[PDB]
Amino acid sequence: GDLVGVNKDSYLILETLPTEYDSRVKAMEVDERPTEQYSDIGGLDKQIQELVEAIVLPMNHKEKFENLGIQPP
Amino acid sequence: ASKLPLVTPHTQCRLKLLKLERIKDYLLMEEEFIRNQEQMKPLEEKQEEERSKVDDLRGTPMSVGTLEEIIDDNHAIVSTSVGSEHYVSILSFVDKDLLEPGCSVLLNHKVHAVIGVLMDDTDPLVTVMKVEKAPQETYADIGGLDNQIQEIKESVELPLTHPEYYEEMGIKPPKGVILYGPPGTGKTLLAKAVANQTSATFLRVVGSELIQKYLGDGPKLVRELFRVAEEHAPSIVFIDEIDAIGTKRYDSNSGGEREIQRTMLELLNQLDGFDSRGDVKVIMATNRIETLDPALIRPGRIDRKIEFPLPDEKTKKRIFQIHTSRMTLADDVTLDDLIMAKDDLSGADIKAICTEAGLMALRERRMKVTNEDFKKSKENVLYKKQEGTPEGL
Amino acid sequence: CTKIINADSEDPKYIINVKQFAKFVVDLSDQVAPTDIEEGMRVGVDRN
Numbered sequence: 001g002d003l004v005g006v007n008k009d010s011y012l013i014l015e016t017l018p019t020e021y022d023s024r025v026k027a028m029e030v031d032e033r034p035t036e037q038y039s040d041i042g043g044l045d046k047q048i049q050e051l052v053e054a055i056v057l058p059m060n061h062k063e064k065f066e067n068l069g070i071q072p073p
Numbered sequence: 074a075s076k077l078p079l080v081t082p083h084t085q086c087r088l089k090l091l092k093l094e095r096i097k098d099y100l101l102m103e104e105e106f107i108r109n110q111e112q113m114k115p116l117e118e119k120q121e122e123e124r125s126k127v128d129d130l131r132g133t134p135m136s137v138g139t140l141e142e143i144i145d146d147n148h149a150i151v152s153t154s155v156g157s158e159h160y161v162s163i164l165s166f167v168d169k170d171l172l173e174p175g176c177s178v179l180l181n182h183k184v185h186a187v188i189g190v191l192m193d194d195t196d197p198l199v200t201v202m203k204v205e206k207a208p209q210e211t212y213a214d215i216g217g218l219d220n221q222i223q224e225i226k227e228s229v230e231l232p233l234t235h236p237e238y239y240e241e242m243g244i245k246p247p248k249g250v251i252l253y254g255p256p257g258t259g260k261t262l263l264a265k266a267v268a269n270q271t272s273a274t275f276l277r278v279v280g281s282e283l284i285q286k287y288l289g290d291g292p293k294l295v296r297e298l299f300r301v302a303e304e305h306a307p308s309i310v311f312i313d314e315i316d317a318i319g320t321k322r323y324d325s326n327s328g329g330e331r332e333i334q335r336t337m338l339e340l341l342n343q344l345d346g347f348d349s350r351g352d353v354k355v356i357m358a359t360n361r362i363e364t365l366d367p368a369l370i371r372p373g374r375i376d377r378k379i380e381f382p383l384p385d386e387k388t389k390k391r392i393f394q395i396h397t398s399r400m401t402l403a404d405d406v407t408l409d410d411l412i413m414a415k416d417d418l419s420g421a422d423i424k425a426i427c428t429e430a431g432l433m434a435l436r437e438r439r440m441k442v443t444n445e446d447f448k449k450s451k452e453n454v455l456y457k458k459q460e461g462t463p464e465g466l
Numbered sequence: 467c468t469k470i471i472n473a474d475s476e477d478p479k480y481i482i483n484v485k486q487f488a489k490f491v492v493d494l495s496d497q498v499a500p501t502d503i504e505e506g507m508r509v510g511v512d513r514n
């Protein structure tokens with residue numbers, strides 16, 4: 001299932017190419033990186049912490065969760 | 074043939090005459106000079122052999138592709154039959170008036186450069202909806218309306234006949250006419266008549282025929298119906314039994330009624346919306362009209378609204394003599410005796426009486442129809458009334 | 467007509483998908499500059 005390039009007539013694989021994804025999938029990717037700080041949302045102060053701890057914390061400090069011996073959410 | 078517009082007052086005047094005399098005189102000078110040249114030299118040989126050069130440029134195995142996007146600049150993207158997409162150059166001899174996306178274009182074999190176009194079928198829907206001449210009859214077979222027929226003639230026929238009247242004063246004709254009244258009273262017939270008598274392409278549709286069993290097909294049908302009506306010059310549309318599609322629009326409803334409302338919105342936009350409707354008229358019929366949507370029958374959508382009463386005393390005599398017209402009757406036919414009764418008879422009821430009497434006359438082998446047969450048939454037809462007698466009265 | 471799907475490496479090398487014909491890994495003729503071509507834009511290529 002890999003993606004390789006072949007000679008046009010001898011049909012001999014000649015190089016490895018990046019995997020193929022449907023263009024629709026690729027368009028879903030972020031490029032602009034919006035700019036809205038955690039100050040712009042007020043009144044949801046518990047929820048913001050919940051989500052930040054759930055999603056971002058594991059990605060940076062994975063050592064904590066490994067130490068407690070818990071899989072993160 | 075792509076002649077100049079006088080754009081004088083456009084109404085019989087001296088300026089319309091002088092701009093008109095001028096074009097005639099120039100055409101006269103041109104014709105004289107052309108005839109002189111043709112006598113001086115046929116040019117048939119020169120005009121020929123240009124066909125030969127063209128046919129040389131377009132090789133024998135010309136390929137029928139399918140244009141898909143004109144870059145607006147004598148280039149195109151033409152798709153071969155298999156499905157490939159090429160980017161070819163449009164040559165100089167193709168009549169560009171005939172180039173629109175989706176047209177079957179005629180490409181070169183080795184170079185696929187566009188070198189012609191072809192005609193297409195004329196029956197997306199044109200055949201299925203157009204009614205041609207009405208087999209029933211012309212305006213002769215309709216009697217008793219007089220005023221209503223006059224209204225329709227002024228609404229739909231007169232703006233085609235003599236545009237000067239409306240044009241002189243700066244007022245456009247009414248938009249649409251809605252025919253409303255008790256069942257069996259002459260709506261569909263009058264539409265048929267004004268169709269078979271006028272000179273446009275008249276299209277007919279039943280409302281229940283816009284209730285489609287796939288989502289988003291009713292709106293497509295209405296959009297097409299109003300799409301092949303500007304392709305065809307002046308045109309008329311008559312959506313009969315509209316009640317089945319346009320209803321009061323009660324919101325507390327579930328099911329396919331939402332699709333009905335959505336097609337109604339599409340129609341409501343087509344009749345009077347963002348764009349200009351071009352040259353088309355809309356007639357409609359509804360036995361029950363109190364139940365239509367206010368936005369469908371509002372002034373700018375349907376200006377004229379026509380009531381259709383039953384025959385009263387004498388139109389009954391007229392209709393009877395219209396349908397009994399072609400049948401040998403005995404000399405004892407007390408027609409008035411059948412008409413005098415105030416039985417609230419309807420026009421379709423009169424036709425039913427005529428046919429039933431004729432049929433039993435056939436049953437009894439008798440070469441002629443007798444009054445006794447007509448009265449018996451009348452009793453038999455009225456037998457289809459029913460209901461609760463004391464109740465309500 | 468061909469639909470570019472990827473532009474790999476800084477060096478021009480373009481994977482295009484000709485509709486219903488084939489899928490190739492081709493380069494830029496001299497007329498087009500590298501900035502003009504992006505991923506996902508229809509492009510025209512020659513028959514040789």
Ligand SMILES: Nc1ncnc2c1ncn2[C@@H]1O[C@H](COP(=O)(O)OP(=O)(O)OP(=O)(O)O)[C@@H](O)[C@H]1O
Pocket residue numbers: 214215216217218255256257258259260261262263358359360392395419420421424
């Ligand atoms: N004044 C009339 N002159 C001639 N025929 C008439 C007249 N009134 C009714 N009819 C007859 O009525 C028959 C029914 O057709 P018609 O077009 O009149 O129906 P309609 O009024 O549109 O009916 P519906 O309300 O059900 O749509 C016609 O065949 C015609 O024979």
Ligand SMILES: [Mg+2]
Pocket residue numbers: 255256257258259260261360
């Ligand atoms: Mg009717």
